[PDB]
Design a protein around this nucleic acid. Structure first.
Ligand SMILES: [Mg+2]
Ligand SMILES: [Mg+2]
Ligand SMILES: [Mg+2]
Ligand SMILES: [Mg+2]
Ligand SMILES: [Mg+2]
Ligand SMILES: [Mg+2]
Ligand SMILES: [Mg+2]
Ligand SMILES: [Mg+2]
Ligand SMILES: [Mg+2]
Lengths: 109, 138, 108, 176, 199
RNA sequence: CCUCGGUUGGCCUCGGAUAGCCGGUCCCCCGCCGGGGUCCGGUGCGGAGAGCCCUUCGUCCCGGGAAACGGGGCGGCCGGAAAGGGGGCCGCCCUCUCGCCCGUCACGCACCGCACGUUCGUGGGGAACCUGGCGCUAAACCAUUCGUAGACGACCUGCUU
RNA sequence: GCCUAGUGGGCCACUUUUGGUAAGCAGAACUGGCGCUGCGGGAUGAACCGAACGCCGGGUUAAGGCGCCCGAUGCCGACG
RNA sequence: GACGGCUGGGAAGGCCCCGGCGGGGAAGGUGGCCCGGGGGCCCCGGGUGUUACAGCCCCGCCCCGGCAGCAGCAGCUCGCCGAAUCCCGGGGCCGAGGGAGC
């Protein structure tokens, strides 16, 4: 009945200064501001949910406009709780700053 | 007006570092920003500890500025700081933070239901007192 | 949770009189294991409640056998639930994330 | 030397290689404050090559061991006699410190010289470090802690953990 | 959804760095009371810094040259813009997520304002170092609405005191209500005390 | 019906000081309940943003607790301009004793392990058809003219008491 | 061992070094570079620092860095 | 998570003046005593001085005194390690090859 995903922000690609590697995304999870707190989320699955114009099929449902790039968390990034995630398709750069749902179910506990 | 002074015998509360959550006795000061401390009853070895990580408490032991750990423990167990520290509101609002940290999901559900009641029972009598003020202000 | 099945799937029921969750399989990597527990040592799980029993067959109706097995496990596990207070309502509730409540901070 | 981390004091004992002229050479002991024993042995060969006509090739080191403090729980005053090169000239100094370890005192001296005089560890030579009693100290920043009933507050407690919420409602208290 | 920050007592660049990072991470930010922002250094030093800013103009067409805004809101806005990559679409959207104000306007005066301790003057400056006021600097360089902002701010503060006195009356009524009903809430207070939500 | 998409509970608010604060209090001293001296507590802020509020699987029986002064809803008064209050309150001819907690009692698509679920959402924008009421029946520009104006546009003027 | 193209304008830097007041000047020695060569870093950049390159995935580094632009200290970093 | 080696065959430290019996010492001088003033006997100043109504430092063995323990149960007072070293768990990436025979 309620929300089951953590909120994260597509902060950008894995990058140096002048070379960005689009295949790896940098997530900022709400509530994670240290690298010690990142250990829960490593390996968890992450979803970029977005709507488009033409309908696509929904698993266990009728076709609607929502579309998903699936991914999962690979490792932490830096001391301040930012995280590296890898998605099936590289995330569109229009999603930078926008929301990624971090699911709870590669459960380890 | 300062009340907490770094002096020989003040119990300090260690905020961070490896001995956080514990109580030390300030045995001597070394320089501007470091003191030889010693916790002989809270399991802290006698060591240099910076001032920025200790938080001063309202408890002052009396021992000399070079007396050893056993005289420090004599003063500590004569003043019974293990129970007087626990009797303060400081340690109670430390352990309340610990209990809210150790809350389980069933604990959070029971807290949610009990608070759900307590807020409504207070909230009806708050408005009852409010209109008992307006009906008696005229 | 009651018993691990032979394929590693978790045989489970939070009772149909509380959850509308029947005798059913779940997966351990897709469930969260909270540290609240009921002693089910005296609970006779039927021996035929296996993965061959729980496998999808091929327009779905509960069979009479599946109707009576849920009763045969509920009539035993429910007095153990109702002997610890507020757990029936706890199971009736669902888990949800709200503002400020973070999963790396919440201990279950 | 790059004065990395807490220094350690080493007793380094060395000698020449025994020639047919000198069948057993005299043995020289030096206290070296160094990050580790490799740097300690290198500074030993620096100082012995400066004092005697002895090189690493013509000599050997028979001992190199870390010398632990006999009272690391006791607050002591330390007198350090210093030789260093500025940008113009070389100066003798004497400085005073307060610590529990003489290695902590020497590394405090090295960072203090780097602060006050912009002098790096390669230009600084320790000559003598001695634990001095409190009556024989010459520096008032050390001597002001020579009080039995010493008493000071911590006046303006700056908020560390500046990013624990990063966005709080309540402005902080700095009085405690 | 909006991060509303009281600009009083903050340092300009520290607050602007944190605000720039938040509007890049996609959070709408409203910084109210921008005349209360402090700048480190003495006032004459800061005044001549903005006077050196004013001396810069396009020599052939100053109407095309650099726009020296005088309001403290727009000066803080310009610092965040200089901290943002404003010549790209992500930068322009980041800037458009940010609102800046002088005083505390009617959308945000009935709202709680956040404070950033990592940007505060009392935390980030030694108490003996001299600071400056953005409102005074702004007024002395050409902002005209300092006095009327001050009058509207005291008009807002005198109503905020009314709201505060009523809130205190409600909370003392809350405390009398707890001591009234402490017989029929005692079996529910113990739950909140054993799980550490009260004492 | 298209289309634009983001989002997935709210915080409805002292002023501020930081070598100091916060809340109560009268036996006081001043003011139009507001302020200060006195006293009492609190202060690693628990009259805590390390916070607060809400907290939802739903329905059926019967019991206890809490409520009864309550819950839901038509006629009046206060409250707002810096970018204006959708709130509190007065009664009404209505209805219920349900809502919240602890229990008794069973029920429901139990869809047979699986993903975009769950909101803000009668969202914004766009056209269109229904379907009832209250209404309202205009200017701009050209053309003509003027010369306070003018390269041309533009500008300033007039054209049925 | 034969045949053999291109080249026979060079330039820069540590150290040595001649003329010149000096020069992003003119002239030598040694070695390494640039030319012939992208890449990380020095904001920018023929030559500096790191390092030389098939097309990719994971990991790790060098030199540089880690308020925000802009990846990285959002360490309750140390001493001045 | 557990084990072990080495060192000054760790240094310090812990317990039994609370190690025993002696001998001294001085100060960042404790009791006392004297002076001075600040309160309702107490506290803070200044002086004297050697244990007393705190402590510190230097047969110390009266079998390295006797015990714990030992590079120390935090998940920190200071190391170098591992033939004197092993167990357990988690996250990520990948599955090249395709007649090995018995
Ligand atoms: Mg030349
Ligand atoms: Mg030339
Ligand atoms: Mg060429
Ligand atoms: Mg080549
Ligand atoms: Mg190259
Ligand atoms: Mg440069
Ligand atoms: Mg080089
Ligand atoms: Mg790679
Ligand atoms: Mg940089």
């Amino acid at each position: 009945s309620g929300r089951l995903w953590c909120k994260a922000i597509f902060a950008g690609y894995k990058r140096g200064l002048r070379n960005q590697r689009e295949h790896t995304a940098l997530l900022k999870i709400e509530g994670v501001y240290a690298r010690d707190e990142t250990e829960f989320y490593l390996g968890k699955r992450c979803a970029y949910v977005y709507k488009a114009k033409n309908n696509t099929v929904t698993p266990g449902g009728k076709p609607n406009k929502t579309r998903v790039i699936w991914g999962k968390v690979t490792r932490a990034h830096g001391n301040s709780g930012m995280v590296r995630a890898k998605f099936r398709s590289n995330l569109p750069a229009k999603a930078i700053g926008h929301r990624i749902r971090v699911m709870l179910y590669p459960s380890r506990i | 007006v300062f009340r907490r002074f770094v002096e020989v015998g003040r119990v300090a509360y260690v905020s961070f570092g490896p001995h956080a959550g514990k109580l030390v006795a300030i045995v001597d000061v070394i320089d501007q920003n470091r003191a030889l401390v010693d916790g002989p009853c809270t399991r802290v070895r006698r060591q240099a500890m910076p001032f920025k990580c200790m938080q001063l408490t309202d408890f002052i032991l009396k021992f000399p500025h070079s007396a050893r750990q056993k005289y420090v423990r004599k003063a500590w167990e004569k003043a019974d700081i293990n129970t007087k520290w626990a009797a303060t509101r400081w340690a109670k609002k430390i352990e309340a933070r610990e209990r809210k940290a150790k809350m389980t999901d069933f604990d959070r559900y029971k807290v949610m239901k009990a608070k759900k009641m307590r807020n409504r029972i207070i909230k009806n009598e708050v408005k009852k007192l409010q209109r008992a003020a307006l009906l008696k202000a005229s | 949770f009651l018993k691990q099945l032979s394929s590693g799937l978790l045989l489970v029921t939070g009772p149909l009189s509380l959850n509308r969750v029947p005798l059913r399989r779940t997966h351990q990597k897709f469930v969260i294991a909270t540290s609240t527990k009921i002693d089910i040592s005296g609970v006779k799980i039927p021996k035929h409640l296996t993965d061959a029993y729980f496998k999808k067959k091929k327009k779905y109706e509960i069979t009479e056998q599946r109707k009576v097995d849920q009763k045969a496990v509920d009539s035993q596990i429910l007095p153990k639930i109702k002997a610890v207070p507020q757990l029936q309502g706890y199971l009736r509730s669902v888990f949800a994330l709200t503002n400020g409540v973070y999963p790396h901070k919440l201990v279950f | 030397m790059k004065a990395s981390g807490t220094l350690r004091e080493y007793k380094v004992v060395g000698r020449c290689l025994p020639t047919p002229k000198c069948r057993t050479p005299p043995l020289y002991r030096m206290r070296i404050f160094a990050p580790n024993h490799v740097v300690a042995k290198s500074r030993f060969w620096y100082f012995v090559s400066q004092l005697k006509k002895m090189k690493k090739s013509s000599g050997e080191i028979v001992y190199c061991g870390q010398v632990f403090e006999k009272s690391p729980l006791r607050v002591k005053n330390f007198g350090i006699w210093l030789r260093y090169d500025s940008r113009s000239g070389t100066h003798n100094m004497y400085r005073e410190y307060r610590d529990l370890t003489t290695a902590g005192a020497v590394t405090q001296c090295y960072r203090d010289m780097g602060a006050r005089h912009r002098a790096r560890a390669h230009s600084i030579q320790i000559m003598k470090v001695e634990e001095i009693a409190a009556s024989k100290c010459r520096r008032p920043a050390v001597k002001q802690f020579h009080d039995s009933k010493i008493k000071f507050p911590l006046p303006h407690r700056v908020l560390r953990r500046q990013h624990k919420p990063r966005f709080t409602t309540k402005r902080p208290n700095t009085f405690f | 959804q909006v991060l509303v920050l009281d600009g009083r007592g903050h340092l300009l660049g520290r607050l602007a760095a944190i605000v720039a990072k938040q509007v890049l991470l996609g959070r709408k930010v409203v910084v109210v009371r921008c005349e209360g922002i402090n700048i480190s250094g003495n006032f004459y030093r800061n005044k001549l810094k903005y006077l050196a800013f004013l001396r810069k103009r396009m020599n052939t067409n100053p109407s095309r040259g650099p726009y020296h805004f005088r309001a403290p809101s727009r000066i803080f806005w310009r610092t965040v813009r200089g901290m943002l990559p404003h010549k790209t679409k992500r930068g322009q959207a980041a800037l458009d997520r940010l609102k800046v104000f002088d005083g505390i306007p009617p959308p945000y005066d009935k709202k709680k304002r956040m404070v950033v301790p990592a940007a505060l003057k009392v935390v980030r400056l030694k108490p003996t170092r001299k600071f400056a006021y953005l409102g005074r600097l702004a007024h002395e360089v050409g902002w005209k609405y300092q006095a009327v902002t001050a009058t509207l701010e005291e008009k807002r503060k005198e109503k905020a005191k009314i709201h505060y006195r009523k809130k205190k009356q409600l909370m003392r009524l809350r405390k009398q209500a707890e001591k009234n009903v402490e017989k029929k809430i005692s079996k529910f207070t113990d739950v909140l005390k054993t799980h550490g939500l009260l004492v």
